[PDB]
Amino acid sequence: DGAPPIMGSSVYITVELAIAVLAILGNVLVCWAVWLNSNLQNVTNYFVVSLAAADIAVGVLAIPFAITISTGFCAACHGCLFIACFVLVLTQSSIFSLLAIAIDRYIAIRIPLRYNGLVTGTRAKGIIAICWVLSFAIGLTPMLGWNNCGQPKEGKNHSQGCGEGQVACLFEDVVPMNYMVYFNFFACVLVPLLLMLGVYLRIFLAARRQLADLEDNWETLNDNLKVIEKADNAAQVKDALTKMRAAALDAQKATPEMKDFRHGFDILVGQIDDALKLANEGKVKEAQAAAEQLKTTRNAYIQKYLERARSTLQKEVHAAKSLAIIVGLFALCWLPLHIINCFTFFCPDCSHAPLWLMYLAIVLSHTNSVVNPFIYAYRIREFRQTFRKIIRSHVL
Numbered sequence: 001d002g003a004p005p006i007m008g009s010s011v012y013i014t015v016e017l018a019i020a021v022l023a024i025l026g027n028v029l030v031c032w033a034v035w036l037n038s039n040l041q042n043v044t045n046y047f048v049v050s051l052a053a054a055d056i057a058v059g060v061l062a063i064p065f066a067i068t069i070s071t072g073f074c075a076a077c078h079g080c081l082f083i084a085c086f087v088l089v090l091t092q093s094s095i096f097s098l099l100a101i102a103i104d105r106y107i108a109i110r111i112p113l114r115y116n117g118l119v120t121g122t123r124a125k126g127i128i129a130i131c132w133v134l135s136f137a138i139g140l141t142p143m144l145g146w147n148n149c150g151q152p153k154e155g156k157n158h159s160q161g162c163g164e165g166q167v168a169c170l171f172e173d174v175v176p177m178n179y180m181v182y183f184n185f186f187a188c189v190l191v192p193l194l195l196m197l198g199v200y201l202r203i204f205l206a207a208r209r210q211l212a213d214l215e216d217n218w219e220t221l222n223d224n225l226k227v228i229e230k231a232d233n234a235a236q237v238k239d240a241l242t243k244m245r246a247a248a249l250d251a252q253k254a255t256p257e258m259k260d261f262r263h264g265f266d267i268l269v270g271q272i273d274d275a276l277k278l279a280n281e282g283k284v285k286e287a288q289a290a291a292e293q294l295k296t297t298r299n300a301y302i303q304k305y306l307e308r309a310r311s312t313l314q315k316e317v318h319a320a321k322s323l324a325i326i327v328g329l330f331a332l333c334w335l336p337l338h339i340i341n342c343f344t345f346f347c348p349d350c351s352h353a354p355l356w357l358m359y360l361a362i363v364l365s366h367t368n369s370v371v372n373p374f375i376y377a378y379r380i381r382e383f384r385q386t387f388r389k390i391i392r393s394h395v396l
Ligand SMILES: CC(C)CCC[C@@H](C)[C@H]1CC[C@H]2[C@@H]3CC=C4C[C@@H](O)CC[C@]4(C)[C@H]3CC[C@]12C
Pocket: 074, 075, 076, 078, 079, 080, 082, 083
């Protein structure tokens, strides 16, 4: 007996088709937005588009392939392998795009002055092409001979009535589990995810250190102003002005609109030097007087540039957190399937995960191709505003 298999298959297929429609629709919207809006045409978003293209292909190709292979139909074994492994190409391309995005944001926060000369559109396009070629080679490695085509299941073969040279096309009968665990999971998925974690950690550490240095320079300036006003001798005034001069050169070093910026620090450093020249001549009262002028420069220029530096860094932190959420949802959607394969492979004494749980893990991995458009809409204003413009105009 047993419940007719078509009832559970009907549920699985209906859900897969629903996922495919949403993956296509949301990721077409991502691509449309980047095409339409020049504010979104930057190197970081070329990798976003390449990632969206991979998720569109999940809806158009990988999900129809997944539906097909669930039937166990008779097929030439290398045709079966291609149907079984093509999703691994798309998932490897996703990993490469995610890693490139992390490295891009790391270069941007670490050497912002060098970023635009290092990371160019033409270089990014070449990297994307190379990553797609490598993704094919990695995901289709079983077609080069690392496969179970040489050891068919003759009982399944005959019970399904397959012809000569055909196998019943079932994922775990043709794709070796040592490939899936050692090569795909450990080397190709888990190592890059761990690298991505380390890069994001370095981004947040770099932002935190720059904000700290900003605050240190600011408090150094203000405290030494208090020392000068409280002072009773030219050499103490002289000492404090020397500490202010270094903090000021550090802040200028670490902060059109850049010509106004120089003028503010020019007034500041020139005023420190005027007060120091007085100091070396022992005119401490005139030095203190001249040091009071610094307060109007601090209020008119230096505090303004401190605030803009701070807000720029907080925006980069917020943007890096958004992109890291994407990486974390990729891991949440793909790890269950990988972990099931580890049990299958490493615990021969364990009963195999039941079929309903296999298909639930497969559906979960596919739902990853729906979620990124929602993260962009909720977390990134320029995407959200462009989405709104597109829908109101071309759908309403
Ligand atoms: C532009 C896009 C849509 C092209 C899609 C190409 C797909 C549909 C083609 C390319 C290679 C094809 C496979 C190659 C060989 C076999 C083995 C045969 O025993 C069953 C069909 C099967 C499994 C084919 C299924 C269809 C297939 C996967």
